[PDB]
Amino acid sequence: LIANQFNSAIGKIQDSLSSTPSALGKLQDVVNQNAQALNTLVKQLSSNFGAISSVLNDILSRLDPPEAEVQIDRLITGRLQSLQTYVTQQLIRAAEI
Amino acid sequence: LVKNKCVNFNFNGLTGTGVLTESNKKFLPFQQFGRDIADTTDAVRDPQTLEILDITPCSFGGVSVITPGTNTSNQVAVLYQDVNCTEVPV
């Protein structure tokens, strides 16, 4: 009886894992959170951050150095803030993991 | 125009850089530039020919130096991460 019950329980676990869509909730959520953080970090590249454009090559061209320096400085401040925020969130998530 | 080689390009002021190859994707007649989920400039059409050029960033990846203790030996083995080394010597 115990062997039959154990075999049936193993089979039922297999069936429940197959059927339930949100069974792997924790792992799926971890993967989704990491992907979302990476996606927002990449999307921060296209943000203007107060410069004339979000394209570094566009800023470098059609611009003299004396003000290209300040435009690049604004871009550096924004992108460094974004990267620091991402790294801190990643540290928090790594501590949780 | 040179293809299948890491060359810088400035398509009427784009001033980008990457590798231009044949693009299997079919640009619509009105569309000129191309982007992705990350709005990276993935494809560009020629300014004189109706040709679509797939663009891939030039190969980059941090190097690592696998070394035993220097007290043991000075020999090292370099690992070029995330690149096939049919193009490593550069």
Binding site: L24, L27, Q28, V31, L38, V42, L45 | D36, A38, T40, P57, F60, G61, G62, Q81, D82
Partner: peptide
């Protein structure tokens, strides 16, 4: 359980096959 702007993902030291072996 279910492009590059300076971003590289490093493969894990233990592959899934060897984790399964463990």
């Amino acid at each position: 359980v279910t492009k590059f702007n300076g971003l590289t993902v490093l493969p894990p030291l233990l592959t899934d096959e060897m984790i399964a072996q463990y």
